[PDB]
Amino acid sequence: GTILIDLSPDDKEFQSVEEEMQSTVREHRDGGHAGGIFNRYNILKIQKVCNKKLWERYTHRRKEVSEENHNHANERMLFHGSPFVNAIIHKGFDERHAYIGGMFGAGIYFAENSSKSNQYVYGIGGGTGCPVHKDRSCYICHRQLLFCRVTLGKSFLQFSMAHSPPGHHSVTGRPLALAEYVIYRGEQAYPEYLITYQIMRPE
């Protein structure tokens, strides 16, 4: 029951998500090893993701979290990257697929820097890069990120686990140290925008 709405480049909604993507790029510690070398994107397509059931799932969980966090959901708009964006927009996030050996355990990972999430698009550590060229810094192949509504609630701070600690609803990690956000229940995030893009070759 997912509908995708293709947003026009003239749309203020398109532009707002576009700006968030470009402006949150950072120069990574790994020198581009995981996600490639770039300081900007070619943004190709922004699609609003509309799924009533996934939204109801999300708001139902948000109510419970808010009750346990002084009536505040601690909601954030965050990026997600993984090879499984197609599955998520249709079925929602699903912690049953989370990697037990994750830095912060078997959760679903989000970032406030688009470039951080970009590092996970082809897998952990950029995996083996694009399928066609096996190139983690591929400028040719089109990538996709999600820009998601995420309920953090009472977030447990951690440095570099299967559920949040008691009384908490997420983990905020700081492993240059950028923030990463981890949820252990898939219904705490709604995949709001599907972004199709390329990393741009610098010059």
Q: Is 109 in the site for ligand 92T (CB under 6 A)?
A: yes
Q: Is 146 in the site for ligand 92T (CB under 6 A)?
A: no
Locus of tokens 């070759």: 201
Q: What kind and span of H or E run contains 7?
A: strand 3-7
133 binds, among Zn ion, ligand 92T, none (CB under 5 to 8 A by kind): Zn ion
Q: Would you say 50 is a known binding-site residue?
A: no
Q: Would you say 148 is a known binding-site residue?
A: no
132 binds, among ligand 92T, Zn ion, none (CB under 5 to 8 A by kind): Zn ion
Which of residues 34, 49, 54, 88 is near ligand 92T by CB under 6 A? 88
Phi, psi of 67 (to 5 degrees): -60, -25
139 binds, among ligand 92T, Zn ion, none (CB under 5 to 8 A by kind): none
Q: Is 49 in the site for ligand 92T (CB under 6 A)?
A: no
Stated length of the chain:
203
DSSP codes joined into one string, 167-184: T-SEEEE------EEEES
Measure the CA angle with vertex 167, ends 161 and 173; round to 5°: 45
Best CA proximity match to 73, nearest among 149, 153, 155: 153
Locus of tokens 């965050």: 78
CB 102 within 8 A of CB 65: no
Q: Is 105 in the site for ligand 92T (CB under 6 A)?
A: no
- Other C-beta atoms closer than 10 Å to the C-beta of 7 total 19
Which of residues 3, 87, 140, 162 is near ligand 92T by CB under 6 A? 87
Size of the site for ligand 92T (CB under 6 A): 16
What is the footprint of ligand 92T within residues 163-202 (CB under 6 A)? 186
Which residues are part of a known binding site for Zn(2+)? 130, 133, 138, 141
- Which residue ranges make up the site for ligand 92T (CB under 6 A)? 82, 84, 87-88, 93-94, 97-99, 102, 108-109, 120, 123-124, 186
